[PDB]
């Protein structure tokens, strides 16, 4: 499906996980920020490409990036 | 206008210019520029079998290194100059400045 | 210490930042070994998302 | 009067006043100096 | 404190008052930027000098002509007159000579104390203490300036004030000769004869 | 200094070079090798103008016409160029120009092929048959050379601009006209008519 | 004559247009009583047209084929009043406006809440800024020469390359 990437600029605010409508992102332990956590995308095959996770990231430029592509059945959001 | 005399004089003059006064300058410039290079290396070094310099045709015994290709080039320039001269003399156009 | 002093005026060298070649005020610097972007910078003007603060490493901030 | 003066100093009210004054000035100038294509000097 | 152009007003910070002719008049802040005031002082000095010369050459000759002695053509019609030389050639010689003079003045302004010596004859030294007043045998033969007393002021104030008056007078002559098409002295006598029907209103609108 | 008293000199123009008066308002000589090339070109241009001025004044003074009309024979078909009145039998259009091209190409090529910049400007040797380099007055002689050279350069530019200004007239005739009416016939006739 | 244009004083098309407009106005006038207000308005129209055409003729305007004044904007001394003189007046006014606006922005960047000063204009500050536009070209040249007019490229936000 689409490709979702997380960068070291993340601050572990979890706001991208809460905005995801298909449960693609999750928070994992990390040691590069004060929050001691970082976002991750273990199940991007369920990603639809809404980039709501991108709109919720507060860093200057996005620590979470969605690149789109493939456009499989789950990606197109088809119920038929 | 004498065609033979004009052509011969122009060709000889430009061959002399290319052989004596301009040969070192042309040699220096071809040495500085060198063979055209494709990307870092020459076209032949990149795998172009048809871009190899023709050494057999470029062999010469003239002590100054004057090659038959140089002869052709300077002779073509001389013939062009001679025919320009002949056409302008046998023109009939007088601007009368 | 890690980076600039608190309250100092720093200029951003991050090319991808909305505030490249812009001046901000340092709010806090974290001394925890392992933090990659510890310097907190406040800016007078917001970015497109509406955020006026960010985190930078000391190597991409210069003193005025 | 502080609040009234602040409101009158807002962008739209001041724009209305300034542009109305400019329009009146131009209209009166055209009343007394109409239909001129060349600046006479 | 010295009198100001507007009573009750505060003089600009960059008009310290020690400068001759100072009255606090800078409402448009044309000399606020440091280092720009000296250039303006030089410009005003030269404008004053040229305007005083112009007024003495416009009013005195026409006044004498009106009296009767030393009859000369009007100043605005003086250009279209026959001379021993062509007007254009005279203009070019004028431009070249003034180019020399004003280039020396420019070199003095850009760096004080550099062009006070004669080029051809090194012995001569036309030395002046302050920029704008080139003391020496030329421009000051009587010795009435050149630091006779510390803090000259008063005489410098006299010259700046008379020059300001001369500038306004010359501009007035220009404008009211463009309007009335009449000599300044004749305009003065017309005003002195019928002051209430020959004025600015009755020349542009009547 | 020099060209403008009191003016700070540019760093690249210290003043040791002949004619170095520090005149460079546009900063063309900032690059050192470009400055050396400019020195060489200035010297060549100045020498050509020096040699050109007598070839413009003498023929007009002797009654053989001005320099602008010196090529006027070539414009007409069958010009039959002349020298001191005597016609030149080999002065047809398609031989003198070729001779010029070949000979000047030879001299230009020999000059171009010398490495040392000092000898590129002042070769000497076979070019000094009368010495004038054994004495200690060599540097001031270079200064005199560049001074007469710039003077002649401006003189030839005046020749050209006056040729455009008054076509069909020679510089010496222009001098006569100035001597006739110095206060009516000047540059003002061209720039402000 | 400056592109084969005759002066409008001796332009036959210009006079023809004069006559046609006056005739049309008089035809519109014939259907009203002389003392009526519409008649006065139409007569004022006729006087306005007459003075307009006389003014156009008196300034040496160039009429082409038929009667239509054409403007020369090449810098000719005989036509400076068409583009160069009003052009300079425009440049003075436009530069006034821009310069005073820039001055106001400068003077409100040092305030504690500049945005409130932009949406709510400080009328006294704005007016004493506007008063400074009389000599705007001198201030512009001074700032340009001093270096306070143009910001250095090192302090301006740019996008990645
Ligand atoms: C950019 C395009 C453009 C241009 C160049 C013009 C230009 C002109 N139009 Mg046109 N017009 C336009 C667009 C344009 N218009 C549009 C879009 C419309 C549709 C709304 C019209 C509708 C229209 C009509 C209906 C009329 C014009 C008229 C005019 C003329 C004079 C208007 C006027 O007020 O002058 C009068 C002069 C002034 C107001 C002078 C400016 C005064 C200020 C305050 C400066 C004060 C002096 C200053 C401080 C000192 C300067 C130095 C000093 C020495 C002078 C002028 C030729 C009128 C005209 O006469 O036609 C020929 C006319 O009747 N236009
Ligand atoms: C050259 C610049 C300049 C300018 C623009 C002004 C302008 C003004 N002055 Mg100032 N003034 C100046 C120079 C200047 N003065 C100088 C050099 C002096 C001598 C120190 C004064 C001394 C002076 C006094 C003492 C007063 C003014 C006053 C005034 C105002 C009323 C005059 C009026 O409207 O005309 C009317 C003209 C006539 C009646 C003639 C006016 C705003 C008066 C004012 O309004 O005070 C606020 C006032 O009381 N001025
Ligand atoms: C072009 C001539 C000129 C120049 C360069 C100066 C320059 C200066 N004057 Mg002087 N001044 C002049 C003319 C001039 N003045 C005239 C004619 C008057 C009589 C009204 C005065 C009266 C005066 C006083 C009373 C004082 C000064 C002061 C100053 C200094 C303040 C900085 C400043 O704003 O000046 C810069 C000025 C300019 C660059 C000229 C701007 C010209 C504008 C753009 C147009 C002029 C307006 C209009 C078109 C013409 C007048 C219209 C008429 C109806 C009056 C500076 C050294 C003050 C100072 O420090 O004392 C030494 C001071 O107290 N001046
Ligand atoms: C800015 C300064 C200035 C300028 C540009 C002029 C310009 C002029 N003046 Mg001068 N004049 C000035 C100041 C100035 N005046 C002053 C301050 C006075 C003293 C009151 C005079 C007294 C004066 C007299 C008495 C006469 C002129 C005349 C003239 C005009 C003829 C050409 C000329 O200069 O005479 C030619 C050059 C000289 C007289 C210089 C001396 C050289 C001779 C050979 C000795 C000319 C327009 C003459 C005129 O009006 O005729 C049209 C004339 O008769 N002027
Ligand atoms: C030294 C300064 C000075 C003096 C003494 C005079 C004196 C005179 N002027 Mg001149 N004038 C001056 C400066 C001066 N003016 C300036 C700076 C201008 C340019 C705006 C003019 C423009 C001018 C015109 C266009 C006319 C006069 C006229 C007059 C006369 C009648 C007064 C008048 O119309 O109101 C003076 C009007 C002014 C606009 C000047 C105001 C400024 C001064 C300093 C006060 C009188 C002889 C009239 C005339 O010749 O009638 C016989 C006339 O038609 N003046
Ligand atoms: C830059 C160097 C230069 C150049 C290009 C010319 C070019 C020319 N000169 Mg000039 N001349 C020069 C230097 C130069 N001269 C100098 C230094 C002197 C002084 C000795 C003269 C003295 C001179 C005279 C007196 C005459 C010329 C003439 C001529 C023309 C005829 C060709 C010729 O000389 O036949 C020479 C041919 C051979 C040597 C073979 C030609 C346009 C003649 C002319 O104007 O006729 C149109 C003429 O009468 N020249
Ligand atoms: C007056 C101008 C002038 C001056 C001062 C110099 C000075 C110098 N030159 Mg330069 N030169 C000039 C003009 C000048 N030259 C011109 C016009 C040419 C082109 C032909 C050259 C070409 C040239 C070369 C190629 C070389 C020099 C060299 C030298 C140096 C040694 C020779 C010497 O002392 O000259 C003394 C000069 C004079 C005493 C001038 C006398 C004038 C004579 C008599 C001719 C005038 C006759 C007539 C009026 C014009 C007709 C032209 C004629 C040839 C037909 C010295 C720095 C050499 C150098 O620096 O190497 C170390 C060198 O290699 N010069
Ligand atoms: C040192 C070199 C030199 C010399 C001695 C002359 C001398 C002369 N020139 Mg020439 N001139 C020169 C350089 C020179 N000019 C240059 C470099 C240019 C190009 C800007 C001109 C462009 C030029 C023109 C366009 C005219 C003259 C004219 C004149 C004559 C009268 C005007 C005058 O006094 O000169 C003024 C010289 C300069 C301002 C320079 C005079 C014989 C005039 C002439 O011949 O009329 C009879 C003429 O119409 N000159
Ligand atoms: C008036 C004048 C300038 C006035 C400027 C003013 C008021 C500026 C005011 C301000 O900037 C300040 C001060 C402070 C700012 O915060 C506010 C303002 C208000 C903006 C200059 C005159 C300047 C006057 C000059 C230069 C006069 C020159 C005269 C000449 C050249 C005469 C030539 C004639 O020669 C005669 C003599 C002989 C004849 O026969 C022939 C000819 C040729 C016609
Ligand atoms: C042996 C020898 C010798 C000699 C030799 C010779 C002399 C050679 C020559 C050679 C030559 C001599 C060559 C030539 C060549 C040429 C060419 C190669 C040409 C070309 C041309 C062209 C191509 C042209 C064209 C044209 C024209 C121009 C006209 C018509 C049209 C046309 C366009 C077609 C000697 C004795 C010294 C000794 C040593 C060795
Ligand atoms: S694009 Fe949408 S679905 Fe995919 S990770 Fe971002 S928020 Fe979740
Ligand atoms: S990617 Fe952005 S929104 Fe998601 S946890 Fe990291 S900083 Fe927060």
UniProtKB/Swiss-Prot annotation, chain A:
Record bears the keyword Electron transport: yes
Cofactor binding remark: Binds 2 [4Fe-4S] clusters. Cluster 2 is most probably the spectroscopically characterized electron acceptor FA and cluster 1 is most probably FB.
Keywords of the record: 4Fe-4S, Chloroplast, Electron transport, Iron, Iron-sulfur, Membrane, Metal-binding, Oxidoreductase, Photosynthesis, Photosystem I, Plastid, Repeat, Thylakoid, Transport
4Fe-4S ferredoxin-type domain sequence ranges: 1-30, 38-67
GO cellular component, one term: photosystem I
Class of enzymatic activity (EC top level): oxidoreductase
One GO-annotated biological process of the protein: photosynthetic electron transport in photosystem I
Reactions mediated catalytically: reduced [plastocyanin] + hnu + oxidized [2Fe-2S]-[ferredoxin] = oxidized [plastocyanin] + reduced [2Fe-2S]-[ferredoxin]
EC number: 1.97.1.12
Main location: plastid
Residues that bind [4Fe-4S] cluster 2: 20, 47, 50, 53
Cofactors, names only: [4Fe-4S] cluster
Single GO term (MF): metal ion binding
Location of the protein in the cell: Plastid, Chloroplast thylakoid membrane
Top-rank taxon: Eukaryota
Chain residues that bind [4Fe-4S] cluster 1: 10, 13, 16, 57
Topological relation to the membrane, as annotated: Peripheral membrane protein
Keyword Transferase in record: no
Assembly and oligomerization: The eukaryotic PSI reaction center is composed of at least 11 subunits.
Entry function: Apoprotein for the two 4Fe-4S centers FA and FB of photosystem I (PSI); essential for photochemical activity. FB is the terminal electron acceptor of PSI, donating electrons to ferredoxin. The C-terminus interacts with PsaA/B/D and helps assemble the protein into the PSI complex. Required for binding of PsaD and PsaE to PSI. PSI is a plastocyanin-ferredoxin oxidoreductase, converting photonic excitation into a charge separation, which transfers an electron from the donor P700 chlorophyll pair to the spectroscopically characterized acceptors A0, A1, FX, FA and FB in turn.
Name by which UniProt lists this protein: Photosystem I iron-sulfur center
Species per Swiss-Prot/TrEMBL record: Physcomitrium patens (Spreading-leaved earth moss)
Lineage: Eukaryota, Viridiplantae, Streptophyta, Embryophyta, Bryophyta
Curated annotation (Swiss-Prot), chain D:
Any single GO BP term: photosynthesis
Subcellular localization(s) per the UniProt record: Plastid, Chloroplast thylakoid membrane
Keyword Thylakoid applies: yes
Alphabetically ordered keywords of this record: Chloroplast, Membrane, Photosynthesis, Photosystem I, Plastid, Thylakoid, Transmembrane, Transmembrane helix
Membrane topology of this protein: Single-pass membrane protein
Database matches in Gene3D superfamilies: Single helix bin
Any matching Pfam family: PSI_PsaJ
GO cellular component, one term: photosystem I
Domain of life: Eukaryota
Family per record: Belongs to the PsaJ family.
Role this protein plays: May help in the organization of the PsaE and PsaF subunits.
HAMAP family per UniProt: PSI_PsaJ
Name of the molecule in the record: Photosystem I reaction center subunit IX
């Amino acid at each position: 499906a689409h490709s979702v990437k997380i960068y070291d600029t993340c601050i572990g605010c979890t706001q991208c996980v809460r905005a995801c409508p298909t449960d693609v992102l999750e928070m994992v332990p990390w040691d590069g920020c004060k929050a001691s956590q970082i976002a991750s995308a273990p199940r991007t095959e369920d990603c639809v490409g809404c980039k709501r996770c991108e709109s919720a990231c507060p860093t200057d430029f996005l620590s979470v990036r969605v690149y789109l592509g493939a456009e499989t059945t789950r990606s197109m959001g088809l119920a038929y | 206008a004498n065609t033979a005399l004009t052509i011969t004089l122009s060709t000889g003059a430009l061959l002399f210019l290319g052989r004596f006064v301009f040969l070192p300058f042309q040699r220096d410039n071809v040495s500085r520029q060198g063979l055209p290079v494709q990307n870092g290396v020459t076209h032949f070094d990149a795998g172009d079998s048809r871009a190899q310099e023709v050494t057999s045709f470029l062999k010469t015994n003239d002590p100054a290194g004057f090659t038959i290709v140089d002869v052709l080039a300077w002779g073509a320039l001389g013939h062009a100059v001679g025919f320009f001269i002949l056409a302008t003399i046998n023109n009939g156009y007088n601007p009368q400045f | 210490v890690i980076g600039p002093k608190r309250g100092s005026i720093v200029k951003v060298l991050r090319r991808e930042s909305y505030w490249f070649n812009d001046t901000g005020k340092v709010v806090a610097v974290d001394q925890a070994p392992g933090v990659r972007y510890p310097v907190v910078v406040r800016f007078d003007k917001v970015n497109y998302a509406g955020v006026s603060t960010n985190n930078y490493s000391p190597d991409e901030l210069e003193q005025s | 009067m502080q609040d009234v003066k602040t409101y009158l100093s807002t962008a739209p009210v001041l724009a209305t006043l300034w542009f109305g004054f400019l329009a009146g000035l131009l209209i009166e100038i055209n009343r007394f100096f109409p239909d001129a294509l060349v600046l006479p000097l | 404190d010295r009198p100001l152009w507007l009573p009750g007003s505060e003089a600009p910070k960059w008009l310290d008052g020690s400068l001759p002719g100072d009255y606090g008049f800078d409402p448009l802040d044309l000399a606020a930027e440091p280092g720009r005031l000296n250039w303006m002082v030089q410009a005003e000095l030269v404008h004053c000098r040229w305007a005083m010369l112009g007024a003495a050459g416009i009013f005195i000759p026409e006044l004498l002509t009106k009296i009767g002695i030393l009859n000369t053509p009007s100043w605005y019609k003086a250009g279209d007159a026959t001379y021993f030389a062509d007007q254009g050639t005279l203009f070019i010689v004028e431009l070249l000579l003034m180019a020399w003079a004003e280039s020396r003045r420019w070199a003095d302004i850009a760096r004080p104390g550099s062009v006070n010596t004669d080029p051809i004859f090194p012995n001569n030294k036309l030395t002046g203490t302050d920029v704008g007043y080139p003391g020496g045998l030329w421009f000051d033969p009587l010795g009435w300036g050149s630091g006779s007393e510390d803090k000259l002021k008063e005489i410098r104030t006299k010259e700046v004030k008379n020059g300001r008056l001369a500038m306004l007078a010359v501009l007035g002559a220009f404008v009211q000769a463009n309007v009335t098409h009449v000599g300044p002295i004749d305009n003065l006598f017309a005003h002195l004869a019928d002051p209430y029907h020959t004025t600015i209103l009755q020349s542009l609108f009547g | 200094a020099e060209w403008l008293p009191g003016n700070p000199r540019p760093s690249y123009l210290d003043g040791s070079a002949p004619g170095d008066f520090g005149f460079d308002p546009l900063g063309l000589g900032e690059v050192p090798e470009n400055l050396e090339r400019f020195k060489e070109s200035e010297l060549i241009h100045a020498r050509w103008a020096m040699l050109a001025v007598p070839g413009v004044l003498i023929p007009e003074a002797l009654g053989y016409g001005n320099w602008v009309s010196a090529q006027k024979w070539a414009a007409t078909p069958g010009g039959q160029a002349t020298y001191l009145g005597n016609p030149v039998p080999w002065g047809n259009l398609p031989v003198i120009l070729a001779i010029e091209f070949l000979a000047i190409a030879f001299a230009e090529s020999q000059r171009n092929g010398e490495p040392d910049p000092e000898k590129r400007k002042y070769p000497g040797g076979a070019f000094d048959p009368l010495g004038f380099s054994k004495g200690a007055n060599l540097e001031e002689l270079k200064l005199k050379e560049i001074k007469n050279g710039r003077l002649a350069l401006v003189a030839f530019l005046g020749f050209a601009v006056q040729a455009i200004a008054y076509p069909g007239t020679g510089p010496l005739e222009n001098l006569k006209t100035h001597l006739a009416d110095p206060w009516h016939n000047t540059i003002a006739h061209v720039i402000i008519p | 004559d400056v592109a084969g244009l005759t002066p409008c004083k001796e332009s036959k098309g210009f006079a023809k247009r004069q006559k046609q407009e006056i005739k049309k106005l008089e035809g519109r006038l014939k259907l009203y009583a002389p003392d009526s207000a519409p008649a006065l308005a139409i007569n004022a129209t006729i006087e306005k047209t007459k003075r307009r055409f006389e003014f156009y003729g008196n300034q040496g305007l160039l009429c082409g084929t038929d009667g239509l004044p054409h403007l020369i904007v090449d810098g000719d001394q005989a036509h400076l009043g068409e583009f160069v003189y009003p052009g300079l007046v425009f440049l003075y006014i436009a530069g006034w406006i821009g310069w005073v606006g820039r001055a106001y922005l400068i003077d409100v960047r040092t305030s504690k809440k500049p945005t409130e000063k932009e949406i709510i204009i400080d009328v006294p500050l704005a007016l004493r800024i506007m008063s400074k536009g009389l000599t705007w070209p001198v201030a512009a040249i001074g700032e340009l020469r001093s270096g306070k007019l143009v910001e250095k490229s090192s302090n301006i936000t740019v996008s990645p390359r």
